[PDB]
Write a protein that binds this ligand. Structure first.
Ligand SMILES: [Zn+2]
Ligand SMILES: [Zn+2]
Ligand SMILES: [Zn+2]
Ligand SMILES: [Zn+2]
Lengths: 205, 205, 205, 205
């Protein structure tokens, strides 16, 4: 659990994300570490990334000297304080999720895998300018009882116990997003599973 | 026809499936073997899979010691008992097929390749919680006269004589799914080939 | 211009086609040769293809001994007799083109690249069972004044002077297909360029 | 900043563009150089491109002897004269952008990344035959206060300080295009961010 092993995984998650069709050189990834977090830097294209580029931001919000952390670092810190169990955070502007956040809609229970994020929906937190404390509060309120949330006019945040499951979850919500937009263009509303049905699935997971 | 050759093929089918855009670390593949089947395990990402991870489940539903078979193993066993000719089963949550299963619609004869699954349609079996005996019965009734079926709010099952044709068929039904949703957004109903026309194509295959 | 050099190119065109997202192990490719043509065989997956699998079919429709030519060989021969200038033929079931052939619509002049196929449209020939003489006649009538045509409920045929341009053209018509279906879901009709405008573009090419 | 280093980058941008899903052997790339520019040649498929194929066109519009510059070179020269700060130009026929240019619509502020191109929109310049002086004037007027523009019934032009950012920007506008068409099929108008909101984002960048 050294710093470089964690930094290598961050980078591999970036590469993997790009390969899955979710990143477009616009996302950012972090892990919980010591009293704060390790995050991707702003400005460096993912493919030029080396272990030594990863940035440490302490619990007070102070970042390592001579390194610029991602421009969206503040809602990574908000996630870690709102959800003590989260150890990794994945943010991207995946097209389908983002398109659903532009309609300012929550993703309802159109598929039983919606339970991976913890309930019968994927919420859409309200718009606030990237990098602000106001955006950070909306994110913290949306992650109180869900592991993933849309961000109106912006994209997605997913958190989990490690980077593997956070990427897995991020991908699953982009599939759910795609399903909802594809079915919504044909019929409105979209048929959903009942709350009873989701409660069984939750128990089963 | 040793166990490892069959296990290697299962793994290659997983890899291939992921490369074709159908799997997203959510499907499961099996082959008929001895008195039961060889299936993919639950919990291991496809890329960490080795021959020794594949799980044997006998005809009584008893799985090898210290191995966890996929969570969806019961409808693989239902397929093998409903269709004696099936020797391999491919299940995934391919986006277009799944989107059609959310509208709870059958895929009708919009293209002459619908005959690869054995008739003039791809049915949609009703919803039941994953991993249950009730889901297993719906699957068994849907595969009685077709080689592939949608599963409402869930995804797809395809079966054939070997893994090569089962993957081939699974991919073909995802193309058919895509065609139907793309045309359905423009016009409802979608023009179909007549039953007479499908009967000629069937004979020809 | 030996037989093996031509057979190697056929195979590379198959591989390339699959890489571009047009083939799904359902198309077939040919080249004009001697008094007939060299075509891909039926039944062999593209990746197992070797120079020695390619099939020669003479001008009388007689194929080499102990080799099965593609099941769709007859409209390849129809193309060569209807268009003396065509030296290669590419057929596939590319999703967007096929979706447009299911609406039984011609692709009109929504983009100036429609002139690559020779006019102000990409026609849609009427349905007839694959592999028949009736299908062959519709194809021959559609290619009289165009280098590419849709085939209702089926897919696409493109022909050109060599395999490079036939694949290039096939890809361009799949892009045109995608543009038309994407715009058609928003507005019906789709704005087009006037015949005057297409006549200038034609002259320019 | 030798000529070959610049020629190598042009080629890599072509390759990269094709890998991102934007090019289809139809775009063209240039860099500002000496008194004119270095551009891709017409007729050579991107994968056969070598440093020695790149063409130099002076400020008078005279191209190197025995080399044919792209057929769309004139609006590359128009870009360089309309925007002194642009050092690289990327043009392609990316499907979503092109589909939006067929509806002859501007892309409005549906996402905060619209500010990368310099304002609250991505304009759509009017149609004129490829390769003409009339097309060149529309492009010059559209790039006066934006770094990217759609071209009605045609595709996209993006310019920036270097090739890296010009490709990055071109990709971002294709994502914006996709978002707008996907949301437009569900609801018309598409919710946008207010001008006040975009003014803050602009300041922040
Ligand atoms: Zn963001
Ligand atoms: Zn499943
Ligand atoms: Zn065909
Ligand atoms: Zn162009």
């Amino acid at each position: 659990m050294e710093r470089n092993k964690l930094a290598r995984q961050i980078i591999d998650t970036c590469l993997e994300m790009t390969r899955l069709g979710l990143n477009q050189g616009t996302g950012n990834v972090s892990v919980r570490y010591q009293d704060g977090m390790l995050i991707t830097p702003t400005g460096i294209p993912y493919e030029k990334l080396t272990e030594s580029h990863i940035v440490f931001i302490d619990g007070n919000g102070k970042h390592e000297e001579g390194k610029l952390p991602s421009s969206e670092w503040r809602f990574h810190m908000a996630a870690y304080q709102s959800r003590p169990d989260a150890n990794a955070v994945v943010h991207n502007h995946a097209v389908h999720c983002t398109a659903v956040s532009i309609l300012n809609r929550s993703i309802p229970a159109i598929h039983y895998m919606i339970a991976a994020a913890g309930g019968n929906s994927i919420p859409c937190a309200p718009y606030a300018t990237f990098g602000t404390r106001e955006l950070s509060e909306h994110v913290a309120l949306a992650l109180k009882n869900r592991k993933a949330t849309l961000l109106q006019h912006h994209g997605l945040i997913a958190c989990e116990v490690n980077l593997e499951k956070a990427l897995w979850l991020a991908h699953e919500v982009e599939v759910l997003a795609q399903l909802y937009l594809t079915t919504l263009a044909i019929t409105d509303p979209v048929p959903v599973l009942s709350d009873e049905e989701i409660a069984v699935v939750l128990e089963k997971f």
